[PDB]
Amino acid sequence: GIVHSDGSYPKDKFEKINGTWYYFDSSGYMLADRWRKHTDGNWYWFDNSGEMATGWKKIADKWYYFNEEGAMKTGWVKYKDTWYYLDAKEGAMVSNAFIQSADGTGWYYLKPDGTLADRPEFTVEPDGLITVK
Amino acid sequence: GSYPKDKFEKINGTWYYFDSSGYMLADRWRKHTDGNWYWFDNSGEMATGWKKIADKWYYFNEEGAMKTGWVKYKDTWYYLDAKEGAMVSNAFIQSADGTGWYYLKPDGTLADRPEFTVEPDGLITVK
Ligand SMILES: C[N+](C)(C)CCO
Ligand SMILES: C[N+](C)(C)CCO
Ligand SMILES: C[N+](C)(C)CCO
Ligand SMILES: C[N+](C)(C)CCO
Ligand SMILES: C[N+](C)(C)CCO
Ligand SMILES: C[N+](C)(C)CCO
Ligand SMILES: C[N+](C)(C)CCO
Ligand SMILES: C[N+](C)(C)CCO
């Protein structure tokens, strides 16, 4: 936290203390373990120490990705040169789902662990039940 | 008594739904008090069977209630979105036990022998 000469402190704004970003509410306390869709329309999240999230974060048993300046991203993002799909709506990594290509031609499959499958092996049964491996 | 209000009513053997004014509903969905959706055509007859409403397809049971999920028609399955009740097509739907997927074709019919072509970058195309 910061306190000025007049004794006032920052309220409802972002502040970078010693090279780390934090957010203080309209009461002067920093958000901790909390989201906030900033005035800039981007979503942010702060952990136990109130530090602004960067990169991947497991939040409430789900995974989100944050750019280097704090905003949550959606769509495809590569990590360890392998792709992941983040729900364009809610923002959490998808898994075991068929996400349709951008050229409407087809689909991209993401395995139960979230990693895109670029060697998907299909197995169909008599009634047509697809089973992906 | 002589002025039907907020109630369904069978007239000339046909179901109609009466709004608060005593006028039939016409070209309107109307989630009833039983948790089901109902549609009435231009005459105000209660929808039954299949109905292409706003270029989207729907299926209602012989009682008027709109169906969702897997409905079998002419020994060929079709899947109805549990969300808005419309007919899914060229999409994959999870099997009821989360063990696999079923593919619904452009025309809406379940494919029993879908063929897959996996391109270099992993992209999948269905036929
Ligand atoms: C952060 N990752 C998306 C790479 C892990 C979830 O599997
Ligand atoms: C909190 N901000 C996103 C405005 C700073 C990072 O550049
Ligand atoms: C939808 N989000 C995951 C971005 C946060 C809402 O609290
Ligand atoms: C999709 N269904 C499982 C209902 C058809 C195969 O029996
Ligand atoms: C399934 N129908 C034959 C009733 C029409 C929708 O394509
Ligand atoms: C079959 N309906 C539900 C439309 C009649 C009940 O009054
Ligand atoms: C989902 N329904 C189409 C049944 C409601 C009207 O929007
Ligand atoms: C990121 N994409 C899924 C669009 C490329 C496939 O490798």
Curated annotation (Swiss-Prot), chain B:
| Cell wall-binding repeat coordinates | 5-24, 26-46, 47-66, 67-86, 89-110
Localisation:
Secreted
> Could you give the domain comment from the record?
The C-terminal domain could be responsible for the substrate recognition.
The record's comment on protein family reads:
Belongs to the N-acetylmuramoyl-L-alanine amidase 2 family.
This chain's function reads: Autolysins are involved in some important biological processes such as cell separation, cell-wall turnover, competence for genetic transformation, formation of the flagella and sporulation. Autolysin strictly depends on the presence of choline-containing cell walls for activity.
Tell me what this protein is called. Autolysin
Can you name the source organism?
A: Streptococcus pneumoniae serotype 4 (strain ATCC BAA-334 / TIGR4)
* Gene name per UniProt: lytA
Q: Report where the shown chain sits in the full-length sequence: first residue, last residue, total length.
A: 192 to 318 of 318
